[PDB]
């Protein structure tokens, strides 16, 4: 299963359980958003 | 921030591509050239 660990990703990419000794780049870890920011102009007030 | 306008190094991180370091460090490469400079006079005196 590629998702569990980077070594698993390497096995999935190569498609072989046994991989020859080497240094191989794999998909980079991606930063995940902790929040959502929306900005829109807010103006005018009803008058009592 | 970006080291230069359109900095390649900062751009690499945003894209996710990475430039790997060279096989030999600068100090080791300098040592190889320094040894060659010392041996230049001696090697070119006789065949072999």
Residue A10 tokens read as 């390497």
Method by which this entry was solved: cryo-EM
The span from the CA of A28 to the CA of B14, in Å, is: 11
The span from the CA of A8 to the CA of A2, in Å, is: 4
State phi, psi for B40 to the nearest 5 degrees. -60, -45
Question: Cβ–Cβ of B16/A28 closer than 8 Å?
Answer: yes
State phi, psi for B27 to the nearest 5 degrees. -65, -45
Q: How many interchain CB pairs under 8 A, A with B? A: 5
**Resolution of the coordinates in A?**
2.5
Of the candidates B26, B48, B44, B45, the one whose C-alpha atom is nearest the C-alpha of residue B36 is B44
* Residues A26, A13 contacting (CB under 8 angstroms): yes
DSSP code for A20? -
- C-alpha dihedral sign at A11, A13, A16, A18: negative
B23 touches chain A (CB under 8 A): no
């Amino acid at each position: 299963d590629c998702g569990f660990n980077d070594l698993s990703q390497l096995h999935c990419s190569y498609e072989s359980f046994d991989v020859e000794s080497g240094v191989y780049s794999v998909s980079s870890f991606e930063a995940k958003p902790s929040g959502s920011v929306v900005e829109q102009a807010e103006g005018v007030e009803c008058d009592f | 921030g970006p080291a230069s306008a359109r900095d390649l190094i900062c751009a690499q991180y945003v894209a996710g591509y990475k430039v790997l370091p060279p096989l030999m460090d600068v100090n080791m490469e300098a040592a190889y050239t320094s040894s060659l400079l010392g041996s230049i006079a001696g090697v070119g005196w006789t065949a072999g």
